[PDB]
């Protein structure tokens, strides 16, 4: 008489993609769902069933803001991509990615290049369970 049922608890979080400039040729993937409730669009605050993972066809969107309604299981925030036949671009892109948990902002990022700016890097993954 000792009864409980110690493992993992899922956590409300909201999530805030900013693309502008030359995003729409570029192939990348938002992750945004969870793998137990249901997620909320940041259009009208529709909510849908679960897991829905996005690919570049589906990246055409410039900005969104995205919730769960219950609790998540399974969770990720990469801003990697892909090199997709030729595209050339010219013309920057501004990534402002924010990851808030239930009431707080705990990760907060911002990519913008355009061939001419000496930074060690170029993408982003992070991973919540």
Same mark, same amino acid.
């Given at each position: 008489?000792?009864?409980?049922?110690?493992?993992?608890?899922?956590?409300?979080? *909201?999530?805030?993609?900013?693309?502008?400039?030359?995003?729409?040729?570029?192939?990348?993937?938002?992750?945004?769902?969870? &793998?137990? %409730?249901?997620?909320?669009?940041?259009?009208? @605050?529709?909510?849908?069933?679960?897991?829905?993972?996005?690919?570049?066809?589906?990246?055409?969107? *410039?900005?969104? %803001?995205?919730?769960? %309604?219950?609790?998540?299981?399974?969770?990720?925030?990469?801003?990697?991509?892909?090199?997709?036949?030729?595209?050339?671009? &010219? *013309?920057?892109?501004?990534?402002?990615?924010?990851?808030?948990? &239930? @009431?707080?902002?705990?990760?907060?990022?911002?990519?913008?290049?355009?061939?001419?700016?000496?930074?060690? %890097?170029?993408?982003?993954?992070?991973?919540?369970?």
């Amino acid at each position: 008489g000792d009864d409980d049922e110690p493992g993992g608890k899922g956590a409300m979080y *909201e999530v805030t993609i900013e693309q502008s400039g030359d995003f729409r040729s570029f192939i990348k993937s938002v992750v945004v769902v969870a &793998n137990g %409730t249901q997620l909320k669009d940041g259009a009208t @605050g529709e909510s849908l069933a679960s897991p829905v993972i996005l690919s570049d066809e589906e990246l055409a969107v *410039e900005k969104v %803001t995205l919730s769960t %309604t219950g609790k998540a299981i399974e969770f990720a925030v990469s801003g990697g991509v892909v090199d997709g036949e030729d595209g050339v671009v &010219n *013309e920057p892109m501004q990534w402002v990615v924010t990851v808030y948990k &239930n @009431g707080k902002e705990i990760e907060k990022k911002s990519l913008v290049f355009r061939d001419g700016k000496e930074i060690s %890097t170029d993408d982003l993954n992070l991973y919540y369970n």
